[PDB]
Each structure stands twice: as C-alpha cells, then as structure tokens.
C-alpha cells in the first residue's frame, strides 16, 4: 500500500497472507469469506508468461494477528480453484481464485470473515466517488534503493480510495478493461493519494454498508500500471459480477 497507513489491531480480521512454502516468501493478500474458504487473485497463482504456476502444496496461508504470544494461524490448502475463463493471456479478466483450507479455521477477535455482497448492496454502493478500503502487506513504494529507503511494511497497511467512473477508467489505460473489473483512486486534481502495490494483489477492497454496518468485499486487488502514479488507477476484480462462479464452487465442493 503506497501512501496508506498502519491498521489498528483487529481492524481487518478477514485479512489473509498467501505464502510460498519454499523458500518462505510473502506472495499475495487474500480474504477470509468463511471458516474454510479463502478468496484471492488468480494471477497470484497462475501467470504462465512469468513462469508462475503454483499448486495447493506449494502454498500456505497465514491468518489472524501478526513480547506477545504468537496468535497467528498457519493453514494448508486442500484445493485451488482458478476461474475457468481467467484471461491471463490478454487483460487479467476474471482475476479470481478460491482456496479451501485443509481444516477449518476458528474465528476469534482477530479472525473473522467478511461478507460477499448481494445485488442490492453492490448496486447501492459501488458507485463513483464512494470510497472503499484496501489493505495489504505489499510494498510502500513502487521503487526503492535497497538499504537506503523503506519499501516493505512491518504492520498491515490501509488506504481508503474512491471508486472511479468507468469512462475515466477506460481512458486512463491502453489495457482493454471489462465489466469484470473496476478502478479506484484519487484523480491528480483531488489532492489526496494512495494505492495498492506489488504484494497487495489478491487482498480485499471492502466497503461498510451504512444500512447494516457490515463490511462487504466489493473488489479484489488485481492490477495497476505502477503504484500511486498521477493519472493512473488500480484495478479490482468485480466480486459481485463473479459471485455466481463463487457459489458454483462452494456449493459443489
């Protein structure tokens, strides 16, 4: 998260860290949507052009709080599910993946799932100028001279970003964007700033329903041409537009 700030303890208890097992390395963000189900970006797991191809056994996830007793929870994955029509070849359309835990996770003060939206919620929020929240352990700067400058965070970072109108999204980039993704961030005019960055991919874009005070995951941190560049915006997988596929996977397995 570029230009964000430190999250408080328990502020984002659906947060999940995706780790490669060997060598141990933070890879991506994720979100807890049930006791056994975890949501992430497909490109975290599968990007052939870069030789990224992981299977359940290559990965573990980390959930909960990160002297103090270590209350963080490590778990393995049963199965990965990349969307069948995930377009890694062209534009990262349908950038979504599901991961089932080997054994279910026990909720606590630090571990709790986030709501997936329904038609009314997605339509009612998820409009331009409305702000969502992004969280991750990804980099603080797009580039940094190693050993002279801080780039990786010590606590979970948070930033609130406004959804951008689709026409502004389309015009900001040469990438062919689809109804399966939206963009967020401040315009150069707007004074404020902030963005996702490398390592924030797969984590959640959440909004608080004023109607029931619950947090909904509206987006998944997907892609961006840089981090926090003027005139440019981060793109998010449109979760509701892909909910039918989320249902299909959970209800069948």
């Amino acid at each position: 998260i570029v230009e964000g700030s430190d999250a408080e303890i328990g502020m984002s208890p659906w947060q999940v860290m995706l780790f490669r097992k060997s060598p141990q390395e933070l890879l991506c963000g994720a979100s807890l949507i049930s006791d056994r189900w975890v949501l992430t970006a497909a490109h975290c797991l599968l990007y052939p052009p870069w030789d990224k191809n992981f299977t359940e056994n290559d990965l573990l996830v980390r959930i909960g709080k990160h002297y103090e007793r270590n209350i963080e929870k490590i778990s393995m994955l049963e199965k990965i599910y990349i969307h069948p029509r995930y377009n890694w070849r062209e534009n990262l359309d349908r950038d979504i993946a599901l991961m089932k835990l080997k054994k279910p996770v026990a909720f606590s003060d630090y571990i709790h799932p986030v709501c997936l939206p329904d038609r009314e919620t997605a339509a009612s929020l998820l409009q331009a100028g409305y702000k969502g929240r992004v969280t991750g352990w990804g980099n603080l700067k797009e580039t940094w001279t190693a050993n002279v400058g801080k780039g990786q965070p010590s606590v979970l970072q948070v930033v609130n970003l406004p959804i951008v109108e689709r026409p502004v999204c389309k015009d900001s980039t040469r990438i062919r964007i689809t109804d399966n993704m939206f963009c967020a961030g401040y315009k150069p005019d707007e004074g404020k700033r902030g963005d996702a960055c490398e390592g924030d991919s797969g984590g959640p874009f959440v909004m608080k329903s004023p109607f029931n005070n619950r947090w909904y995951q509206m987006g998944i941190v997907s892609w961006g041409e840089g981090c926090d560049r003027d005139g440019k915006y981060g793109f998010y997988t449109h979760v509701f537009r892909l909910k039918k596929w989320i249902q299909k996977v959970i209800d069948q397995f």
């Binding site: 700030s5 999250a7 408080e8 303890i9 328990g10 502020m11 208890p13 659906w14 949507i33 049930s34 606590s108 003060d109 630090y110 709790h112 799932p113 986030v114 709501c115 997936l116 929020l125 100028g129 409305y130 702000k131 969502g132 929240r133 948070v158 609130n160 406004p162 959440v206 909004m207 608080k208 329903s209 004023p210 005070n213 619950r214 947090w215 909904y216």
Partner: peptide
C-alpha cells in the same frame, strides 16, 4: 455466514476505527 463483516474489536464493541467515518462521509 450470519455474522460476517462485523468485527469483534470494533462493531461488536461499538468502537470505530480511525478512518471509517471517511467511508461513510463519502456516501453523503
């Protein structure tokens, strides 16, 4: 899940995180 998106250390205790009002204020 029936209790999803309600955070034990915030909504369940009637506490607000530092920056959430900024989200609500954006809906106005």
């Amino acid at each position: 899940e029936a209790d999803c998106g309600l955070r034990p250390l915030f909504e369940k205790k009637s506490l607000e995180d530092k920056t959430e009002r900024e989200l609500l204020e954006s809906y106005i």
